[PDB]
RNA sequence: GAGACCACCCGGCGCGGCGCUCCUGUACGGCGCAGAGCCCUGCGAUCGCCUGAGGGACGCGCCUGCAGAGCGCGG
RNA sequence: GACCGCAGCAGGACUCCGGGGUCAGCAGCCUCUAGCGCGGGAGCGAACGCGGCUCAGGGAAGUCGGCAAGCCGGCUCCGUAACCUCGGGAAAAGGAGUGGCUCUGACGGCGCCGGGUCAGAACUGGAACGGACGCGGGGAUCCCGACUGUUUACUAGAAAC
């Protein structure tokens, strides 16, 4: 018989299989289309989100109630340490799919990438890349084979690795990411570019800018085994029904006889990869400077730290993105952040005027620790 | 080689139920100080166990300075944990005092 | 109602009383519905200050506006709601004024403080409002 | 930038922390936490309780 | 940061100190020219001062202490 | 603690004697004496279930139906309606107080000695006080059966008997 009433199935089918995340961190997968031609450009970088702050903003939406006024919002700071160019990857276009031509590596390859090809680095047998580093450091390996790139490869990308040293985090190895070099006038200037950047750092300021949009991707934080209410937002059925509420009461008709991949059942409610798309980049410092989290109206030093130190996060040395709203996954995950796909088009011009640098711990009253100690006088 | 040392009992009971408590607290002692010793047989002094369990099952005192003796050796190495009464466990860290 | 409203938490749902601001002689509105309320099933509808609700003016009432469903306003509302400033308000009590479905209101006064939200709706509301808290 | 006060703690509310409570006495009251808020609900004396900018003016620690 | 068991992601862990910060609301004790009174030369709930004190921490930085990487098993 | 239920079975099974505190109490909650740690233990702290706890704003919109939960409650002093078979209703309904200290009267007791209740008073205290415990939610009706009783052990406690 008919359901009798209209509502929506409960939750996204796409979203399954909704199983623990198989890969090692989130991954970028697509990368920004070419648009051949552009200036020169690097796509997305790997950070580790550091906390939540929530800042005051001057908007300028026109026709909005909140044009010419003042907006508290929550901003996400994720730090990111420079990454270091380890290697430049070349994939030709096949007609079976980006095939990649070769990965040419770099001359030399550093402590916290190289830890990444050892389960154990300090009992591990320290072979990788030994023959690699003979046949290399004349550069004449390097170049030739460089060469080869372009002429067969279309999308050049470069292998980069965070330097975890930098970070508060337990890491001690480096995450590799492929980053796709764009916009070059062709893929000769791309491959040259690439060559440019080998062996030295990249920093977050350089790949993105304040106020254009980024998508974070990562793996969301784990529940563990859920049930259908809190895994799939069904309705806990009536306090009367035996056995338990917290349960989808109906798994199917009596035919189709197997139960289906539609119908909401128990299972991992968390750890899933996911990607969240256009965030307004709001600022994107160093915590070097002591005055990168003060603006006009401060009148205070202020740096990015807050009083107490980020919960569940570190010192955040170094430069950091912080940006509009929330990115997916807990404090310390790798989150990698792409030049967005598809911006929101309207969205109101960034001009921050009060940036909380009060403890997150606890609740603060103090935006400076100097302030507390002239509070509380002796 | 004798070492005096704290065990923060109410980390310790951390996690597990209120009514396992002091039980949960003396396994703990054990294991802690199998770490402190690097031995495998632990015993402890009546001393300690009228201690732990001076508040009754459900609450631990916080904190225990014990004395663990590593009386035994020569393929034995037993470890003897005494209770040390303290005022107040203020500056107090582990000292290793002494060698066999 | 005048523009775009935001989003507010709407602290009544359908059989919420609330004491009635104006001087009407209604002392005590019933929620019947919300007007501009396309519901989920099972959802009682829900409204927040500055959403016209169809009120019954209950017994304690003058007889006069007594047993006809009516419009009215809510003005004010026990559950915290965020602005987009990030000033968390809420009042002492939940409170309505009731209105023609054209925007006059029925009474000449609106007694104590009214909600900037309900405010900007309704300027008949913001004029006669001593104050806009 | 611009600071409010908690009425009954009387210590400095920074931007978008905080809630305020518009009375039937027309008088918005701002209040930093939910203990400056419980404390007012519960008619418990600003003075009497030690940590409010008050019982420490009445003491004259703070002034 | 992950989990029913596993798996995952990490690895000279951890322990217990010291700072920072936060929570709670001014510690025990001493003193008093506070105290309604009482009857005897003391009692007395409270109160004030020392004392945004004391106590606590699962959050952050640090080490002034013990420590911490199998001669295990596979290959 | 050995009886009877296939059993060393949350089931039944007749008595006798019965301390302390708080309390009106042999109630509830703690304890002396006396007894004594039950077909086992370790981890872990998922879903879900069982036994509980709290929940913003709303306040039965949920449901066959307020089922379940919750409100209420001790004591003192006010105050209390229709109706009525004048006995009731009635704890109707509805208010107010309650702690601790320091006292002050009463009352028998005189060679003044022995009571622990009833009043009244100051001073106190995050705006607390039956602080745990124990412990009616109330009202307006309508239908039956006057009532207290009895009943289908093991699905009907009823308006049935």
Redesign the pocket.
């Given at each position: 018989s008919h359901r009798k009433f209209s509502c929506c199935r409960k939750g996204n089918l796409g979203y399954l299989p909704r199983k623990?995340?198989?890969?090692?961190?989130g991954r970028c997968k697509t990368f920004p289309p070419d648009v051949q031609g552009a200036p020169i450009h690097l796509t997305a970088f790997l950070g580790?989100k550091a906390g939540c702050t929530h800042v005051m903003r001057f908007i300028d939406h026109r026709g909005s109630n909140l044009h010419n006024r003042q907006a508290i919002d929550q901003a996400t700071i994720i730090d990111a340490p420079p990454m270091i160019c380890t290697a430049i990857i070349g994939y030709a276009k096949t007609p079976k799919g980006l095939r990649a031509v070769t990965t040419v590596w770099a001359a030399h390859i550093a402590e916290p990438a190289m830890?990444?090809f050892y389960?154990?680095?300090?009992?591990a047998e320290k072979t990788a890349f030994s023959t690699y580093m003979k046949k290399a450091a004349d550069g004449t390996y390097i170049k030739e084979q460089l060469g080869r790139l372009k002429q067969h490869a279309d999308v050049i990308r470069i292998v980069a690795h965070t330097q975890?040293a930098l970070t508060?985090?337990?890491?001690?190895?480096a995450?590799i990411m492929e980053i796709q070099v764009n916009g070059g006038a062709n893929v000769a200037e791309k491959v040259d570019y690439a060559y440019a950047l080998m062996e030295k750092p990249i920093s977050i300021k350089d790949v993105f800018s304040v106020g254009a949009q980024i998508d974070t991707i990562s793996?969301?934080?784990?529940?563990?085994?859920?049930?259908?209410?809190?895994?799939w937002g069904v309705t806990?059925?009536?306090?009367?029904?035996?056995?338990?509420?917290?349960?989808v009461a109906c798994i199917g008709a009596w035919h189709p006889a197997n139960v289906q991949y539609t119908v909401a059942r128990?299972?991992?409610?968390?750890?899933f990869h996911r990607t969240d798309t256009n965030k307004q980049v709001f600022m994107i410092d160093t915590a070097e400077n002591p005055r990168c989290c003060t603006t006009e109206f401060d009148l205070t030093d202020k740096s990015i730290?807050?009083?107490?130190?980020?919960?569940?996060?570190?010192?955040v040395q170094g430069d950091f993105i912080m940006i509009k709203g929330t990115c997916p996954?807990?404090?310390?995950?790798?989150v990698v952040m792409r030049n967005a796909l598809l911006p929101h088009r309207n969205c109101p011009p960034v001009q921050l005027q009060w940036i909380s640098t009060?403890?997150?711990?606890?609740?603060?009253?103090?935006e400076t620790?100097?302030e507390?100690?002239q509070?509380?006088?002796? | 080689?004798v070492?005096e040392?704290?065990?923060?009992?109410?980390?310790?009971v951390?996690?597990?139920?209120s009514k396992?408590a002091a039980?949960?607290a003396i396994?703990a002692i054990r294991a802690?100080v199998e770490?402190?010793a690097?031995v495998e047989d632990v015993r402890l002094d009546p001393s300690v166990n009228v201690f732990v369990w001076s508040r009754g099952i459900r609450h631990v005192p916080?904190?225990i300075?014990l004395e663990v003796r590593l009386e035994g050796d020569d393929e034995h190495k037993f470890a003897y944990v005494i209770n040390k009464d303290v005022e107040?466990?203020?500056?107090?860290?582990?000292?290793?005092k002494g060698s066999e | 109602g005048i523009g775009n409203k935001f989003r507010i938490?709407?602290?009544?749902?359908?059989?919420?009383?609330?004491n009635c601001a104006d001087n009407s002689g209604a002392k005590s509105l019933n929620?019947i519905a919300v007007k501009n309320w396309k519901g989920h099933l099972?959802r009682?509808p829900?409204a927040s200050v500055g959403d016209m609700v169809l009120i019954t003016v209950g017994r304690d009432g003058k007889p006069e506006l007594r047993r006809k469903v009516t419009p009215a306003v809510v003005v004010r509302?026990?559950?915290?709601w965020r602005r987009k400033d990030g000033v968390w308000i809420?009042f002492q009590?939940?409170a309505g004024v009731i209105i023609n479905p054209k925007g006059e209101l029925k009474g000449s006064s609106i007694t104590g403080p009214v909600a900037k939200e309900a405010a900007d709706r309704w300027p008949k509301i913001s004029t006669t409002a001593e104050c806009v808290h | 930038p611009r600071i409010e006060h908690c009425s009954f703690c009387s210590?400095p509310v920074y931007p978008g922390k905080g809630i305020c409570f518009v009375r039937n006495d027309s008088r918005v009251f701002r209040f930093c936490?939910?203990?400056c808020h419980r404390?007012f609900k519960?008619?418990?004396?600003?003075?009497?309780?030690?940590?409010?900018?008050t019982?420490?003016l009445?003491?004259?620690?703070?002034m």
């Open positions: 623990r995340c198989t890969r090692g961190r580790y830890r990444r389960r154990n680095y300090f009992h975890p508060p985090l337990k890491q001690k190895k995450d793996i969301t934080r784990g529940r563990g085994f859920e049930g259908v209410v809190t895994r806990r059925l009536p306090r009367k029904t035996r056995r338990g509420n917290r349960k128990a299972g991992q409610m968390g750890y730290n807050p009083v107490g130190g980020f919960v569940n996060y570190g010192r996954g807990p404090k310390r995950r790798p009060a403890s997150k711990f606890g609740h603060g009253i103090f620790v100097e507390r100690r509070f509380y006088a002796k | 080689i070492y040392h704290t065990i923060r009992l109410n980390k310790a951390r996690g597990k139920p396992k039980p949960i396994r802690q770490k402190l690097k916080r904190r300075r107040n466990f203020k500056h107090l860290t582990t000292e290793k | 938490s709407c602290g009544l749902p359908v059989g919420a009383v609330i929620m099972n009682f829900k509302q026990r559950k915290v809420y009590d939940n | 210590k936490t939910s203990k404390n519960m008619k418990r004396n600003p003075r009497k309780v030690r940590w409010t900018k019982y420490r009445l003491h004259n620690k703070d």
